[PDB]
Ligand binder design. Structure first.
Ligand SMILES: Nc1ncnc2c1ncn2[C@H]1C[C@H](O)[C@@H](COP(=O)(O)OP(=O)(O)OP(=O)(O)O)O1
Ligand SMILES: [Mg+2]
Length: 903
DNA sequence: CGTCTTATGACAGCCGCG
DNA sequence: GCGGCTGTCATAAG
């Protein structure tokens, strides 16, 4: 098989690479790399290398990288361009790996660990690292074993060995419920002393050296902590054993309050799972404690223990060890579901970068573009510095705030990348400019055709159609990968809906979940095998369909991000090809394209419909249009449709067979009008929304820009067995909104759109009646702990100081000197509750770390002094009032004037 | 070392207001 | 002692 890299580092004049040879064995190299850079030269200077604009360059080979850096600064001291790849690590991979990398993941040692550390005086700081590590669980993907390092003896207790037999037992038999799947994969190692455990851990680290280090929060806790603890006991030299190349870096970043350390292990790609989640998950969570995320991702209970963690090792060492194990395992199950490491490797090897550079899309693209550029023997520009500058973005329509009964929506397939292609927008494909008319004339088609030689954008730019661009090129490859995985995702989602109808009446049977690829549309035979199955068999099938869909999701949405991020890279001063003429060519074209097609969509329907000058497009954002479908439904009445599904099928058939080709006609005309390389503007039918047949439900409603809800029956060819609410922007969708309140506002919106005004008031009346009974956490608001320092007037609120910030200050006074209480960390989320007048906390509100409960020290005061009236109005009724008004509804009851007829 | 603009709402403080 | 406005902040939609 082909050879592929594991890690790579630059150290001085030596490149340190770990890799896999033709055999699948893992080797290392120390390479004394001889990089090449480039400089322009006169025309008559024969050469194979040219810059991207067409200009001759001579290659300058160098003895070593220091000398190549020495040259880059001198070229600037003189002030001439130093073209080429300034980052020599990427150049070396590009040299060593002159092909498309296919990689054997089973040969890649992904390690996954967590440590435990008892502390009676509050959170154990890794900076200091002043407490014993009393447990570590290190899972190794190659061995497929969890290595448990256990400390029987410590200043904080002498404990007996952990019993696997006990750990296996269920928590109702008095055990730990450590999963079946992992009981035969634990290798357990008790230790008398710390020094011993550590040394063994280090030796173990040497023979099973992690290529990808991951885990929950390891980057800010685990890694730093083991490093410093080992460093303080055995000296810094021993600590460096953690790096296979024996080189490390300490990035101390003293927050305005206390210390904080970041350790770089050369030779290892640390991918902390917390960061991979934030980037790739497309969620904004109330809290990021593993405990919370496990719940959310896996529907799986909180690892339970009595008393505080600080004395679990002494109370119940058995539990203590088991939780450190299951903690490791959970991250493995989350990744089984989400595939973020899989993703990371894909992009990583695709771009040919260090795996941990998947976090920076600027890096990713620089390497993709360089590699692509290198094979055509072209020289890349030098990165140049730039001031930051605003530039205009997308166009959003102001919708008339109303109820909407029948709504059909349409959206462009990857707008900004398609534009990039359609127009051939790239650094080296720029043809010049042209005098631009008010954009509203290009929208209307009045303005002079800007050029009939060059491909154009309404911002005034012109592009070549002859030659093809680096960016269009590279953006197209990844787009197709996106497209493929989107295909599988959407199929899985349909297969999901087919299984959902099957369990409306499952065949009384003892059967077998079918052996099938959930990525593809269930064929007839298998659909007819489907309904003959049992609930047990069918649920397993659903579960699996769902796991496929989610996996397709990840692959799809993250590749979508990467390309959209190429666009965003164009508007970013740090990007080698940073360029605002291109960035605005994209967005301005986006604006024209969205309004242009509004006009056409509005024109065609007024035609086919009968009237003239009726606004059918009620709304649109960047690349979407939401068309009102009332008058089209009105062209057959309420009668002719048997059931709900009959008018859905209709609209779908109408969109597909009448509207779409009209759209297509419109967009290819615009393509001509703009003289673009290729027509690539596609609006796929997205949503079909309305009320269920002969019900008093409102279908949809807009409140303003970015704020609407709809009742959807079909989303992009998927015919849900249950109508699903599509809610955008409203507080139900915001992680700041209290949990129970998200659920309530949602049941409301579901009530307005499906049932009607009647149902709303009924449920509204119930909710406020029961409100005071809800769990304080479930009804707390969430915010981020930012800039506490800045607003701290020596203990009290400063000028301008925000609500949640104010809440945090009151907390910190109410926990003065108490070091057992959880402090609040900068940047992390807090729960927020308002306080009643006269409370003993001083202020009108309080805040505490989210994902956790408030410490007992204040727990019972906050619960007494809690302010429900305020909470209900600010968090539930104000929001509901917003929705209510727009929809023309009341959520309560008007002044009868017919009350005179009571009883 | 470093994706982007557009837009909403909860709040704070400012200002006018017999 | 408020409703209208502006700016800061947190957080959505694309
Ligand atoms: N995270 C982002 N960064 C930069 N630009 C974005 C981002 N999200 C969206 N955009 C811009 C460019 C998109 O093409 C345009 C419309 O976005 P959107 O419709 O969500 O997806 P898309 O049109 O790129 O693909 P698709 O509609 O197929 O999911 O808005
Ligand atoms: Mg789109």
């Amino acid at each position: 098989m082909k050879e592929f890299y594991l890690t790579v580092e630059q150290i001085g004049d030596s490149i340190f690479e770990r890799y896999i040879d033709s055999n699948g064995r893992e080797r290392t190299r120390e390479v004394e790399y001889k990089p090449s850079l480039f400089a322009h030269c006169p025309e008559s200077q024969a050469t194979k290398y040219f810059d991207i604009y067409g200009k001759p360059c001579t290659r300058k080979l160098f003895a070593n990288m220091r000398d190549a850096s020495q040259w880059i600064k001198r070229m600037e001291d003189i002030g001439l361009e130093a073209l080429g790849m300034d980052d020599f690590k990427l150049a070396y991979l590009s040299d060593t790996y002159n092909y498309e990398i296919k990689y054997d993941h089973t040969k890649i040692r992904v390690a996954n660990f967590d440590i435990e550390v008892t502390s009676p005086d509050g959170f154990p700081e890794p900076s200091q690292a002043k407490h014993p590590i009393d447990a570590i669980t290190h899972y190794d993907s190659i061995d497929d074993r969890f290595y448990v390092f256990d400390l029987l003896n410590s200043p904080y207790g002498n404990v007996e060995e952990w019993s696997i037999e006990i750990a296996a037992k269920l928590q109702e038999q008095g055990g730990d419920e450590v999963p079946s799947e992992i009981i035969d994969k634990i290798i357990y190692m008790p230790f008398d002393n710390e020094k011993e455990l550590l040394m063994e851990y280090l030796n173990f680290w040497q023979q099973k050296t992690p290529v990808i280090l991951t885990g929950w929060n390891v980057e800010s806790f685990a890694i730093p902590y083991v490093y410093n603890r080992i460093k303080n006991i055995f000296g810094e030299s021993t600590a460096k054993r953690l790096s296979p190349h024996r080189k490390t870096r300490v990035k101390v970043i003293e927050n305005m309050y206390g210390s904080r350390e970041i350790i770089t292990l050369f030779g290892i790609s640390v991918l902390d799972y917390i960061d991979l989640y934030k980037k790739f998950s497309f969620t904004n969570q109330p809290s990021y404690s593993l405990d919370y995320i496990s719940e959310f991702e896996l529907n799986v209970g909180k690892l339970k223990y009595d008393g505080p963690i600080s004395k679990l090792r002494e109370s119940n060492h058995q539990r203590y060890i088991s939780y450190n194990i299951i903690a490791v395992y959970r991250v493995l199950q989350i990744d089984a579901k989400r595939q973020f490491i899989n993703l990371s490797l894909d992009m990583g090897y695709y771009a040919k970068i260090q795996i941990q550079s998947v976090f920076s899309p600027i890096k990713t693209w620089d390497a993709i573009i360089f590699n692509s550029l290198k094979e055509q023997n072209k020289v890349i520009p030098q990165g140049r510095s730039h001031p930051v500058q605003p530039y205009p973005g997308a166009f959003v329509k102001e919708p008339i705030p109303n109820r909407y009964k029948y709504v059909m929506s349409f959206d462009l397939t990857s707008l900004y990348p398609s534009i990039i292609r359609q127009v051939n927008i790239s650094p080296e494909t720029i043809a010049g400019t042209f005098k631009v008319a008010p954009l509203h004339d290009y929208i209307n088609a009045v303005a002079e055709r800007p050029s009939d030689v060059y491909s154009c954008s309404p911002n005034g730019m012109m592009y070549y159609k002859d030659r093809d661009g680096v960016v269009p090129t590279e953006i197209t490859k990844v787009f197709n990968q996106r497209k493929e995985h989107k295909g599988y995702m959407l199929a899985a989602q349909r297969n999901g809906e087919i299984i959902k109808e099957a369990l409306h009446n499952p065949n009384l049977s003892v059967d077998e979940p079918l052996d099938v690829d959930y990525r593809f549309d269930f064929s007839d035979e298998i659909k007819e095998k489907i309904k003959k199955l049992s609930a047990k068999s069918l649920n397993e099938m659903l579960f699996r369909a769902q796991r496929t869909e989610v996996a397709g999701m990840t692959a799809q949405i993250n590749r979508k991000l990467l390309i959209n991020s190429l666009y965003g890279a164009l508007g970013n001063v740090w990007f080698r090809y940073y360029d605002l003429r291109n960035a605005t060519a994209i967005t301005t074209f986006g604006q024209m394209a969205l309004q242009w097609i509004e006009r056409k969509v509005n024109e065609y329907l007024n035609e086919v419909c009968g009237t003239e000058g009726e606004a059918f497009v009620l709304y649109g954002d960047t690349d979407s249009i939401y068309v009102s479908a009332d008058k089209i439904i009105d062209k057959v009445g309420e009668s002719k449709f048997r059931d709900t599904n009959h008018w859905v099928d209709f609209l779908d058939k109408f969109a597909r067979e009448r509207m779409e080709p009209a759209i297509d006609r419109g967009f290819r005309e615009m393509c001509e009008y703009m003289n673009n390389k290729q027509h690539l503007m596609f609006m796929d039918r997205e949503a079909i929304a309305g009320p269920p047949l002969g019900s008093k439900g409102i279908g949809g409603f807009w409140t303003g820009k970015k704020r609407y809800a709809l009742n959807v029956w079909d989303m992009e060819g998927t015919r849900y067995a249950e109508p699903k609410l599509k809610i955008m922007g409203l507080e139900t969708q915001k992680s700041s909104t209290p949990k129970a309140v998200q659920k309530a506002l949602k049941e409301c919106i579901r009530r307005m759109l499906q049932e009607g005004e009647e149902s709303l008031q009924e449920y509204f009346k119930e909710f406020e009646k029961e409100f005071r009974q809800l769990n304080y956490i479930s009804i707390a608001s969430v915010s981020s702990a930012n800039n506490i320092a800045k607003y701290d007037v020596g203990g009290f609120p400063g000028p301008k100081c925000p609500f949640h910030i104010r809440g945090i200050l009151t907390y910190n006074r109410a926990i003065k000197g108490n070091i057992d209480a959880p402090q609040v960390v900068e940047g992390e989320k807090v729960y927020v509750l308002p306080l009643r007048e006269g409370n003993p906390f001083g202020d009108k509100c309080i805040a505490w770390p989210s994902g956790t409960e408030i410490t007992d020290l204040i727990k019972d005061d906050v619960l007494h002094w809690m302010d429900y009236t305020v909470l209900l109005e600010k968090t539930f009724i104000k929001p509901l009032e917003g929705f209510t008004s727009a929809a023309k509804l009341d959520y309560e009851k008007k002044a009868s004037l017919f009350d005179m007829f009571d009883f």
